[PDB]
């Protein structure tokens, strides 16, 4: 079970599954979102990156393992809705 934890526009934590066909990709959020964490095989992974989307803040948030505070990230870093994001997980 591969799934991502992300916050919507209203700063609410939600979980969405990942489609593993022809790679790892996510789409159809329907709202501005900021990806928080990625889980592959019911475990937390680090060192992931996007091969088509350039965004340092989400990479920095994902790669850190400790608990984070949602009061430090502004609305600027939020990605636009209906965005196709691909994952490159090391293995």
Residue numbers in the entry: 1 to 91
What does the paper say about this structure?
In this study, we report a detailed characterization of ΦCjT23, an icosahedral temperate ssDNA phage with an inner lipid membrane, isolated earlier from a strain of Flavobacterium (previously Cytophaga). The virion structure determined by cryogenic electron microscopy reveals similarities to members of the viral kingdom Bamfordvirae that currently consists solely of dsDNA viruses with a major capsid protein composed of two upright β-sandwiches. The minimalistic structure of ΦCjT23 suggests that this phage serves as a model for the last common ancestor between ssDNA and dsDNA viruses in the Bamfordvirae. Both ΦCjT23 and the related phage FLiP infect Flavobacterium species found in several environments, suggesting that these types of viruses have a global distribution and a shared evolutionary origin.
Following the approach applied to the MCPs, we calculated a localized reconstruction of the internal part of ΦCjT23 spike (penton domain), in addition to the FLiP penton base from our previously published data. The resolutions of the localized reconstructions for ΦCjT23 and FLiP were 3.4 and 4.0 Å, respectively. In contrast to FLiP, the entire spike of ΦCjT23 is made by one protein, P13 (283 residues), which forms both the capsid-internal and capsid-external parts, analogously to the spike protein of phage PM212. The capsid-integral part of the spike, corresponding to the P13 N-terminal penton base domain (residues M1–F91), sits in a slightly raised position relative to the type 1 MCP trimers circling it. The penton base domain is a small β-barrel (SBB) with a β-strand topology that differs from the topologies of better-characterized SBBs29, and from the canonical β-sandwich fold observed in pentons of other viruses such as FLiP and Bamfordvirae members. The ΦCjT23 spike SBB is formed by anti-parallel β-strands β1, β2, and β4, and additional β-strands β3, β5, and β6. The region connecting strands β5 and β6 include a short α-helix (S55–D64) and a long loop (L65–F78). The α-helix resides at the monomer–monomer interface. Part of the loop (L65–N71) faces toward the central cavity of the pentamer. Together the five loops close an oculus in the middle of the pentamer.
